[PDB]
Amino acid sequence: SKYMTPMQQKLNEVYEAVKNYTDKRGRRLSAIFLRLPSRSELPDYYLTIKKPMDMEKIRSHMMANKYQDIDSMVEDFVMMFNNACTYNEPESLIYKDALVLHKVLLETRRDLEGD
Numbered sequence: 001s002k003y004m005t006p007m008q009q010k011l012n013e014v015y016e017a018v019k020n021y022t023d024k025r026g027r028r029l030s031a032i033f034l035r036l037p038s039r040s041e042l043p044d045y046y047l048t049i050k051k052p053m054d055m056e057k058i059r060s061h062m063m064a065n066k067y068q069d070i071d072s073m074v075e076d077f078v079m080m081f082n083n084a085c086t087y088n089e090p091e092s093l094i095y096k097d098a099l100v101l102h103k104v105l106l107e108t109r110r111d112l113e114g115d
């Protein structure tokens with residue numbers, strides 16, 4: 001069945017808002033967040049970040065129809081952004097981008113408050 005429920009459409013809309021966000025120069029902030037590198041690639045990350053999260057994991061949960069509500073998806077995004085702001089320094093661009101995307105997430109959730 002190609003037709004999504006209102007909840008499914010709302011989940012997709014929030015996911016896509018974060019994924020598709022581009023700055024004024026056209027840089028897609030989500031690019032580095034889609035797939036976390038491997039443990040062999042970033043040993044320190046997996047030793048220090050308790051619950052690794054990336055947007056492909058979120059997408060997967062969504063496509064599997066496993067998010068029962070919007071809050072649950074937001075929680076995973078917040079986890080990811082907090083992991084990024086934990087691992088990386090406040091001065092780093094990745095840290096900064098995480099803060100921008102967090103705002104896109106909350107703004108998107110809020111703008112869809114009344115659906």
Ligand SMILES: O=C(/C=C/N1CCC[C@H](c2ccccc2)C1)c1ccccc1O
Nearest residue numbers: 032033035036053054080083084087094
């Ligand atoms: O913190 C994250 C990544 C950090 N490092 C330092 C910035 C550049 C590193 C990188 C470099 C090249 C390709 C992919 C990732 C990743 C991160 C990536 C995806 C999902 C959550 C994250 O916290």
Ligand SMILES: [K+]
Nearest residue numbers: 085086088089
């Ligand atoms: K930090």
